[PDB]
Amino acid sequence: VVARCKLVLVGDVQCGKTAMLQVLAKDCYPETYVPTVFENYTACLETEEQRVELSLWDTSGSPYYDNVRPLCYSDSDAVLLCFDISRPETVDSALKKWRTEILDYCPSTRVLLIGCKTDLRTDLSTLMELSHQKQAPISYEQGCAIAKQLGAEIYLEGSAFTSEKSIHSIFRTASMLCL
Numbered sequence: 001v002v003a004r005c006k007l008v009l010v011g012d013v014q015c016g017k018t019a020m021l022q023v024l025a026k027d028c029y030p031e032t033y034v035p036t037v038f039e040n041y042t043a044c045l046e047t048e049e050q051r052v053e054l055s056l057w058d059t060s061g062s063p064y065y066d067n068v069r070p071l072c073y074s075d076s077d078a079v080l081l082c083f084d085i086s087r088p089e090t091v092d093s094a095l096k097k098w099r100t101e102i103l104d105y106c107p108s109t110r111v112l113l114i115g116c117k118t119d120l121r122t123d124l125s126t127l128m129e130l131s132h133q134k135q136a137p138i139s140y141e142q143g144c145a146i147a148k149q150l151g152a153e154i155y156l157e158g159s160a161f162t163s164e165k166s167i168h169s170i171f172r173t174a175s176m177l178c179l
């Protein structure tokens with residue numbers, strides 16, 4: 001049985017949503033930022049004991065689209081709440097805003113927390129730039145703690161830029177959780 005699964009990604013502008021989808025579905029990384037309006041992707045993968053067909057909905061992180069974004073939440077198997085690990089702020093109150101929008105659509109919808117750009121954890125520009133904000137990249141441990149406080153089923157993370165296998169792994173796990 002080829003199982004079918006609808007996943008929606010949401011999160012702040014530039015947090016890494018499209019980069020993940022392009023890697024997963026097109027084996028393509030976009031080094032230059034092009035803001036998303038809306039896009040759909042299709043990916044097939046094997047998830048443990050199943051072939052799964054993923055229907056993936058890419059949304060804009062911009063508040064300009066707040067009135068129209070919830071329309072893609074219908075009949076979703078999970079919403080992937082994404083954040084940039086290098087920006088303890090796409091996390092901060094913003095993941096609360098994001099979590100509430102998903103709750104306000106339907107409290108029954110499953111939420112997975114996805115950390116993006118994990119390669120920036122050891123990047124020296126990121127480290128210093130954040131240090132004089134008295135901050136540091138989000139660690140794996142912090143990701144898990146955030147997932148708990150946002151009622152996400154799991155924290156998963158990757159790097160679209162340096163590890164395509166980290167991305168395929170996120171979506172394999174996401175699919176098993178929805179099956």
Ligand SMILES: Nc1nc2c(ncn2[C@@H]2O[C@H](COP(=O)(O)OP(=O)(O)OP(=O)(O)O)[C@@H](O)[C@H]2O)c(=O)[nH]1
Nearest residue numbers: 014015016017018019032033036060061159160161
């Ligand atoms: N260092 C690093 N940069 C990344 C990674 N993934 C994406 N980026 C960078 O961040 C930019 C923004 O990524 P996107 O995927 O386009 O951002 P987005 O979440 O889709 O943003 P919106 O469409 O505006 O909501 C990319 O063009 C890359 O320059 C990553 O894994 N590591």
Ligand SMILES: [Mg+2]
Nearest residue numbers: 017018035036
């Ligand atoms: Mg995008």
